[PDB]
Structure formats: structure tokens, C-alpha cells
PDB file of C-alpha atoms in Angstrom:
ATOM      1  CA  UNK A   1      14.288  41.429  52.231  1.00  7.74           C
ATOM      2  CA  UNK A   2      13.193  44.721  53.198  1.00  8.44           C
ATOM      3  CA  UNK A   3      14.025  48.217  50.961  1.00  2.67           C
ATOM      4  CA  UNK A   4      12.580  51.026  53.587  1.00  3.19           C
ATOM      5  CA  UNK A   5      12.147  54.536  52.242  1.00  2.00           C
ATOM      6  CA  UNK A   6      12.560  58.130  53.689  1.00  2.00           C
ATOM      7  CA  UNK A   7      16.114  57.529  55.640  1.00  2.00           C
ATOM      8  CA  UNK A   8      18.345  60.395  54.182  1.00  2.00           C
ATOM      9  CA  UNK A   9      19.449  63.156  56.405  1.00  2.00           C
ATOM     10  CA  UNK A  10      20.323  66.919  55.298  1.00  2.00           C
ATOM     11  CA  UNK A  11      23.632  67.516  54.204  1.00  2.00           C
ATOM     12  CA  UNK A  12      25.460  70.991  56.141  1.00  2.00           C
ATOM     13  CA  UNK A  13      27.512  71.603  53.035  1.00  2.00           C
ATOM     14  CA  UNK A  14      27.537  74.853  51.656  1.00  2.00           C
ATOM     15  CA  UNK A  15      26.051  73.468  48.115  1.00  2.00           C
ATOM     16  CA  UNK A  16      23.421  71.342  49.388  1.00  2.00           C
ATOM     17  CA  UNK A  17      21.546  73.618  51.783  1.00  2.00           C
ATOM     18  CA  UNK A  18      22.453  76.555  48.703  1.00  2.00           C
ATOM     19  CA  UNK A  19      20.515  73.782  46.232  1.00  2.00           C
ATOM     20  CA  UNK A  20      17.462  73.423  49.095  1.00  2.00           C
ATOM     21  CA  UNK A  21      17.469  77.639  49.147  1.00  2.00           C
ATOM     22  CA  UNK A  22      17.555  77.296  45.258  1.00  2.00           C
ATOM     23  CA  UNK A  23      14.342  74.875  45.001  1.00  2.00           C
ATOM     24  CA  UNK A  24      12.430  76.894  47.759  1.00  2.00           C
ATOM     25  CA  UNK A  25      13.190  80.924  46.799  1.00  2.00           C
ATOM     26  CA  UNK A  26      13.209  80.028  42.989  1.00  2.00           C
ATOM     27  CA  UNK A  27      10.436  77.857  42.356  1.00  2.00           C
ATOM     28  CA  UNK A  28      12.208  75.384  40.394  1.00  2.00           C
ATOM     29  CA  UNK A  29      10.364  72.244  40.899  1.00  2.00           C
ATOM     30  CA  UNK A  30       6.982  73.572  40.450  1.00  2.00           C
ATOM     31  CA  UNK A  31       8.546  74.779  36.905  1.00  2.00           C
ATOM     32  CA  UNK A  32      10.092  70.848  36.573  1.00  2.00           C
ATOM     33  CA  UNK A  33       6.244  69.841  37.013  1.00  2.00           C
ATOM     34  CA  UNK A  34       5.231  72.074  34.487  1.00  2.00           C
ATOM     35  CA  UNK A  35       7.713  71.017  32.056  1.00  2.00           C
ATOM     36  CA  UNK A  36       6.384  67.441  32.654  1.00  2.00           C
ATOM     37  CA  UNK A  37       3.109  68.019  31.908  1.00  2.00           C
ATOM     38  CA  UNK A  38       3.699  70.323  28.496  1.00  2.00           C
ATOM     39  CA  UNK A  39       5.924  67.214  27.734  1.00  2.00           C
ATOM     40  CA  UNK A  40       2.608  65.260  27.508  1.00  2.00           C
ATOM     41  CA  UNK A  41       0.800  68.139  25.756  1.00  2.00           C
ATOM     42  CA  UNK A  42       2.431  67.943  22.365  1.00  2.00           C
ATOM     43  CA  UNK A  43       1.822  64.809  22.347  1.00  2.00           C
ATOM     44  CA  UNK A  44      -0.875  62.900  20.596  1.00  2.00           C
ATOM     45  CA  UNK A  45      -3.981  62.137  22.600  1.00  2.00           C
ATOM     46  CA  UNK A  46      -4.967  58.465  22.340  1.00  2.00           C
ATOM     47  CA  UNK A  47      -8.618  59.301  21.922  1.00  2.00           C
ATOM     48  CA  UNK A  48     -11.298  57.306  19.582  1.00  2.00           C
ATOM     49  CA  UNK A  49     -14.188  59.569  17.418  1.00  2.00           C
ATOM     50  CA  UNK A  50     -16.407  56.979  19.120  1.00  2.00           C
ATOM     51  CA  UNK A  51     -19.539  56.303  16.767  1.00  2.00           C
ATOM     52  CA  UNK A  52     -17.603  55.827  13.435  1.00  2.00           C
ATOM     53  CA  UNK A  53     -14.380  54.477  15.610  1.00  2.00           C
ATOM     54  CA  UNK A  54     -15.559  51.379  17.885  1.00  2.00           C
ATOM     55  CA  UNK A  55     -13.518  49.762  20.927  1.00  2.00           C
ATOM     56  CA  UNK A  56     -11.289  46.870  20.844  1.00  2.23           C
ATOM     57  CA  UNK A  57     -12.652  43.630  21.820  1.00  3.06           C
ATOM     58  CA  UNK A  58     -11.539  40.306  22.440  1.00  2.00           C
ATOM     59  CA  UNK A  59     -13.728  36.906  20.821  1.00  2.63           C
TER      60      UNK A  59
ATOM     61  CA  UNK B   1       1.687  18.187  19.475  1.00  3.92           C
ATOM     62  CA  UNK B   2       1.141  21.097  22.029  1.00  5.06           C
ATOM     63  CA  UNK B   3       0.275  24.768  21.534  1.00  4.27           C
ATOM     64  CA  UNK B   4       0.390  26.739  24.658  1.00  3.00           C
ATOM     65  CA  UNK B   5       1.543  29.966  25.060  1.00  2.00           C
ATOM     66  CA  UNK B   6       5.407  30.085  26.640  1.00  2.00           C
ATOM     67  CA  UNK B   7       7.965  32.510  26.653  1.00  2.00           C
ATOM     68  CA  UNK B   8       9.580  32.116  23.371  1.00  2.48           C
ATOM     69  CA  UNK B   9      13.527  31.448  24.534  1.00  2.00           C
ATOM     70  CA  UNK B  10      13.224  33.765  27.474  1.00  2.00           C
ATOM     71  CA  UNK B  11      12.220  37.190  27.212  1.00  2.00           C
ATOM     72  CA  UNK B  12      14.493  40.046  27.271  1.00  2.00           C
ATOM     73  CA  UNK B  13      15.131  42.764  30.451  1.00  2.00           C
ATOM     74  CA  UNK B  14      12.487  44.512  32.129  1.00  2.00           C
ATOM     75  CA  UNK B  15      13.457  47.871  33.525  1.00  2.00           C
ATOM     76  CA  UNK B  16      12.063  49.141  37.232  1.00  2.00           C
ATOM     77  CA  UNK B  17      14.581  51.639  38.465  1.00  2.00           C
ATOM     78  CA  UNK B  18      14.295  55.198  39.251  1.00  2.00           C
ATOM     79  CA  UNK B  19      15.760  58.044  37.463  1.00  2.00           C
ATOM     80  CA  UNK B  20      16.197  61.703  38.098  1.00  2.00           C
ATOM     81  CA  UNK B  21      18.280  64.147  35.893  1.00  2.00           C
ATOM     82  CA  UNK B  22      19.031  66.519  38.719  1.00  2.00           C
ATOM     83  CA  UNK B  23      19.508  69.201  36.703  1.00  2.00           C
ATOM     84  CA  UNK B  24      20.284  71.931  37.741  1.00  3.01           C
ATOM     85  CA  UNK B  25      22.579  74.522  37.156  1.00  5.40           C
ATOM     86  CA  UNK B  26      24.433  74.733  40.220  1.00  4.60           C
ATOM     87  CA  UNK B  27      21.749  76.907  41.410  1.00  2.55           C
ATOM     88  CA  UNK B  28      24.027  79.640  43.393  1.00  3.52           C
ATOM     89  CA  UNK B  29      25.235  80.871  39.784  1.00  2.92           C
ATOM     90  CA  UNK B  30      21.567  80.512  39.154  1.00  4.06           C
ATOM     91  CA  UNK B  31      21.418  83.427  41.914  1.00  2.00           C
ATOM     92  CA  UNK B  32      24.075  85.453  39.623  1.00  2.39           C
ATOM     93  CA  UNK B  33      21.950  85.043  36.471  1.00  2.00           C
ATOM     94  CA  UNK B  34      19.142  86.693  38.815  1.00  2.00           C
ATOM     95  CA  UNK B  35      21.232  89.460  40.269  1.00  2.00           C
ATOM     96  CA  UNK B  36      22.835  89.397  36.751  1.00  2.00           C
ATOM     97  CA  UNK B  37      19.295  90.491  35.216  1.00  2.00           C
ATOM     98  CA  UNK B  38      18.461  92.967  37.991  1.00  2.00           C
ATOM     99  CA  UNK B  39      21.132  95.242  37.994  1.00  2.00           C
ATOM    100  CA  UNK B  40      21.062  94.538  34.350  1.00  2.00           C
ATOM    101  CA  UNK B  41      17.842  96.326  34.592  1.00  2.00           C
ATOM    102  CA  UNK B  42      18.628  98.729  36.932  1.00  2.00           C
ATOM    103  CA  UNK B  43      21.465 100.332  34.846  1.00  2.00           C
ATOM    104  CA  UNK B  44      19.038 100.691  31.891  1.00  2.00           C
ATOM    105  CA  UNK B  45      16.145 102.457  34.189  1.00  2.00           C
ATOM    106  CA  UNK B  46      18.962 104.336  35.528  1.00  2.00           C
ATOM    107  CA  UNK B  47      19.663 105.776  32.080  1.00  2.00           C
ATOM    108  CA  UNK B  48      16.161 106.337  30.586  1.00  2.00           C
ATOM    109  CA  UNK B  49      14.807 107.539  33.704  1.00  2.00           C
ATOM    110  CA  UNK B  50      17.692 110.200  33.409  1.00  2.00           C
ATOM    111  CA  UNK B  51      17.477 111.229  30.211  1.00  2.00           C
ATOM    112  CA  UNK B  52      13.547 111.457  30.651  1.00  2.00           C
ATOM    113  CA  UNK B  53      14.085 114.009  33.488  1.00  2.00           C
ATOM    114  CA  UNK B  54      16.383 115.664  30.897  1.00  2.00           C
ATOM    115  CA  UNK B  55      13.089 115.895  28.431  1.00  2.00           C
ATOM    116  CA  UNK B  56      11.090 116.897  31.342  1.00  2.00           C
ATOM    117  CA  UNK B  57      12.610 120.063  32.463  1.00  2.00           C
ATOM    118  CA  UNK B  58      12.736 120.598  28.720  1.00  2.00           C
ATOM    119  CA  UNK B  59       8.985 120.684  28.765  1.00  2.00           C
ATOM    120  CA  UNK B  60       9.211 122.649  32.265  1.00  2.00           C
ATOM    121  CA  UNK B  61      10.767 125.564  30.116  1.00  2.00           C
ATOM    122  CA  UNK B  62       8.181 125.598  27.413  1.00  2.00           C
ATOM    123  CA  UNK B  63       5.441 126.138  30.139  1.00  2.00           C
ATOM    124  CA  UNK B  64       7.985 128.729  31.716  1.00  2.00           C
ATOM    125  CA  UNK B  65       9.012 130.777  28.270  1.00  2.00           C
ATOM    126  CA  UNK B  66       4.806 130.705  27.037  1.00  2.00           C
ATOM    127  CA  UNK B  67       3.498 131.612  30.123  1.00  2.00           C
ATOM    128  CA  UNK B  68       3.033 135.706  30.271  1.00  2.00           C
TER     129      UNK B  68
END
């Protein structure tokens, strides 16, 4: 069973190659990235306060 | 008796598919909220910058009436 990847091809409708001007003129996936990665800034950051705050272990 | 460790009754579903919102906007009407906001901003320069010309040759005839 084999799933390959990359086999689409580019689509001469009006909308699609209107989306693919979209993305490149307007920057909108670079903005998608950056709303990914404030999405993991108000997070909370799984640190430890290390000397007061040991590891996890196993016996 | 035995104590191993076994799935207990079979485990529930495990997700692995992708997923993309593809959104959006229909991105040619995102083209009319830019030209929208540019002649939006055009017709308000067009009417201060107007009305500051008006103030301007006010202050032209101030020099002009002071000068002799």
C-alpha cells in the first residue's frame, strides 16, 4: 500500500489562480504562521523553577 | 492470578488525519476591502489636503497685507 505525496496540478479557474494571487500579493500565509505561533504564546509555558521544583523520575 | 498490563476492553480511537480550515475570505473581495480602504483614504486626503490649501493662502494673505 503506497499513499505518494505532491501529485495535484493547478487549477485554470478564475478562483483558484485569484486565491494563488491572493496568498502571494497579500501575504496571507506568512500572517496564518503568525497567528499559529501567538496561538502558543498565551499559552502557559510548561517550564519547572528547577532547584525548589525537581524532575520526574521513574523507580 | 496474573497482573500484566493489557488494554483494558480495547482502547478507544486514535486520530491521524490532516486538517486545514482554508479560510479565507474569498480573497478577490479581499482585493475590494483593499481598494475599499484606499480610495477610502484617498477621498479623506482629498478633502483635508483641500481645505489645508484653503488655510494656506489664508496665511499667504497675512504675509501679503503685513508686508509694507
Amino acid at each position: 500500500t503506497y499513499k505518494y505525496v505532491n501529485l495535484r496540478e493547478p487549477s485554470m479557474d478564475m478562483k483558484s489562480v485569484t486565491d494563488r494571487a491572493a496568498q502571494t500579493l497579500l501575504w496571507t500565509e506568512l500572517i496564518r504562521g503568525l497567528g499559529m505561533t501567538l496561538s502558543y504564546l498565551f499559552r502557559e509555558p510548561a517550564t519547572i523553577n528547577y532547584p525548589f521544583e525537581k524532575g520526574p523520575l521513574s523507580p | 492470578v496474573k497482573q500484566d498490563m493489557p488494554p483494558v476492553g480495547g482502547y478507544g480511537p486514535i486520530d491521524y488525519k490532516r486538517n486545514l480550515p482554508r479560510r479565507g475570505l474569498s480573497g478577490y473581495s479581499m482585493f475590494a476591502v483593499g481598494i475599499g480602504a484606499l480610495l477610502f483614504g484617498y477621498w479623506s486626503m482629498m478633502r483635508w489636503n483641500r481645505e489645508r490649501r484653503r488655510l494656506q493662502i489664508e496665511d499667504f494673505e497675512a504675509r501679503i497685507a503685513l508686508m509694507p
